[PDB]
């Protein structure tokens, strides 16, 4: 596996008109999938990282914005990274995106980490344009290979025993931090239960306790649930993505939780900015912003 060559051809289009494709060989991509899939398994399903590190939310196929994102916070291993899932789908270039990410996960397995968003699942991959991208540029078989790689992704990360991170949010079933570690991989993302909720759930100001989720899957939780949880596990923050926010970062439960969204103009239907959370060794968090375009 010629990792450096791959990364090279990928970074090469850096600032060269919007949407210039980078076509690796399907054999190179399988390499990325299988050799990273190895890493994901040998590593814990519930990661334990340490500052400093930059954190990012949904990228959703917007590859050139992922470039600006590194261009702004520093390409690895300059900065440590945690990504909160939702790498493919909707965007124009899911293939380049997920490849560059799986590549860095292999190059710097210890300074680069990836969690699993709800869109890292064949149930919605097929629908929202990732399976289509594969089918168009490569073949069905290859997509079937990604979903074997995604099925082995980490679900959550706990930075410095203070920040708890996952794509969606909390769950009525998440009472023991071990319930997460007991989750066996590889695994599909279910309709109900802990794993599902961890990737689907949402914060809601108007909700008290556990309410129905407008998504038609999982629940919504309120500011009480947040505090009662941060207190049961001695955590000071919850960092998650999953939801578009105007500024790129947005607070909830009075800064007891933050929402990160790294893809500016989620579909060209938002004019929202993208954010990324810088966390120095002292746990002093700042929000580098990737403005859209006016």
């Amino acid at each position: 596996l010629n990792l450096d060559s791959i990364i090279g051809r990928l970074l090469e289009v850096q600032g060269s008109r919007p949407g210039k494709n980078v076509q690796l060989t399907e054999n190179e991509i399988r390499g990325l999938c299988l050799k990273s899939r190895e890493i994901f398994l040998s590593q814990p399903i519930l990661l334990e990282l340490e500052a400093p590190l930059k954190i990012c939310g949904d990228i959703h196929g917007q590859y050139y914005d992922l470039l600006r994102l590194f261009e702004y916070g520093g390409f690895p291993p300059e900065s440590n990274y945690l990504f909160l899932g939702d790498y493919v789908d909707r965007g124009k270039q899911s293939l380049e995106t997920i490849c560059l990410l799986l590549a860095y996960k292999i190059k710097y397995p210890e300074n680069f980490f990836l969690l699993r968003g709800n869109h890292e699942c064949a149930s919605i991959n097929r629908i929202y344009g990732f399976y289509d991208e594969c089918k168009r540029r490569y073949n069905i078989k290859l997509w079937k290979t990604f979903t074997d790689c995604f099925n082995c992704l980490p679900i959550a990360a706990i930075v410095d025993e203070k920040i708890f991170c996952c794509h969606g949010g909390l769950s009525p079933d998440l009472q023991s931090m071990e319930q997460i570690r007991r989750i066996m991989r590889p695994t599909d993302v279910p309709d109900q239960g802990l794993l599902c909720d961890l990737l689907w759930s949402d914060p809601d100001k108007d909700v008290q306790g556990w309410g129905e989720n407008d998504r038609g899957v999982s629940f919504t939780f309120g500011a009480e649930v947040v505090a009662k949880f941060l207190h049961k596990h001695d955590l000071d923050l919850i960092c998650r993505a999953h939801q578009v926010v105007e500024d790129g970062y947005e607070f909830f439960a009075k800064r007891q939780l933050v929402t990160l969204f790294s893809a500016p103009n989620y579909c060209g239907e938002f004019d929202n900015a993208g954010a990324m959370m810088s966390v120095d060794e002292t746990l002093m968090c700042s929000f580098q912003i990737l403005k859209p375009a006016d």
Binding site: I163, D236, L237, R255, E281, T282, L283, M284, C285, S286
Partner: peptide
């Protein structure tokens, strides 16, 4: 050396 946030 603990958790707080910028502006």
């Amino acid at each position: 050396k603990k958790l707080r946030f910028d502006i």
